[PDB]
Design a binder for this molecule. Sequence first.
Ligand SMILES: Nc1ncnc2c1ncn2[C@@H]1O[C@H](COP(=O)(O)OP(=O)(O)NP(=O)(O)O)[C@@H](O)[C@H]1O
Ligand SMILES: [Cl-]
Ligand SMILES: [Mg+2]
Length: 317
Amino acid sequence: EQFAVGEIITDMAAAAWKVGLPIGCIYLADMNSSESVGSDAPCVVKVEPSDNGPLFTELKFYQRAAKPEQIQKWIRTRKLKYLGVPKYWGSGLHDKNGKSYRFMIMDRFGSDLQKIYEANAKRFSRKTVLQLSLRILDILEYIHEHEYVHGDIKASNLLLNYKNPDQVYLVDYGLAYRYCPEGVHKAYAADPKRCHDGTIEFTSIDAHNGVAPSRRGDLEILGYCMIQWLTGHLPWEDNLKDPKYVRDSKIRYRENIASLMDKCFPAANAPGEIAKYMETVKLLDYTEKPLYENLRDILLQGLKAIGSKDDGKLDLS
Ligand SMILES: Nc1ncnc2c1ncn2[C@@H]1O[C@H](COP(=O)(O)OP(=O)(O)NP(=O)(O)O)[C@@H](O)[C@H]1O
Ligand SMILES: [Cl-]
Ligand SMILES: [Mg+2]
């Protein structure tokens, strides 16, 4: 344990918070009061030692790109219903037993998508996948425009709004990467400071090639997520201890998208927007800016094809 239960901690902006039970490095948290922190807590506090690299990285992301007003101004300007980027609420330093810790306050979210996926026998419907992906595309556009790539989009990093199950949020920026510091795009090479390569089954060909992640890589990761969610599988899932096999398959399947559709979907029965999205992402150069509205239009055609529309309904349960 890093905190005493009911402990009051004060962040760098002098806002006071109260610590509750773990949700062991994440606790329920709320604004300081006489009341005890309950299971209905609107916040969480993440705490790690001061020397922990991922919390520092994550905190720098939240401080630079997730301030409540910069998020609200984006939502207003882009006329969005919401933006699945968790808001930054504060951070500080905390001492315990002569050891220095860093903490960060963020909103409390509900279930991860991986649990809902596993309870639905490892399937999400076409409507769900298109609705999730439209929101993920808004999220990616936002973080990319704020000089960052996520590099690790997957169902376990996607959380529902604790009070609204039609609102999904992308979490975990511990290994996010600033691909465009001060508007200067990174070169096609490895970052010496950066070690990680994402989640093997979903990671980009760029990551497999040992180069730093860029915008096309996050869009390619979303592509593998869509197939996985729609079919319950990926062609290379039985060879995940062999990264050169996983890369070889991804390369061969990018080169011939129709054979990927033939492999993943029942014979001659593949949703067309998936192949079109993948062909679009395939045309991006390492440093090129994606045309997000074009990608979102590809998915909207998919919603039209099933006789639906972008009504923001995730259709989970
Ligand atoms: N703001 C949040 N609200 C609610 N739950 C959260 C929040 N942030 C993280 N969690 C969940 O808490 C768990 C641990 O979080 P975290 O350590 O940051 O993720 P991780 O490193 O990617 N995975 P793992 O260490 O294996 O649990 C996960 O199941 C998260 O979905
Ligand atoms: Cl199955
Ligand atoms: Mg997390």
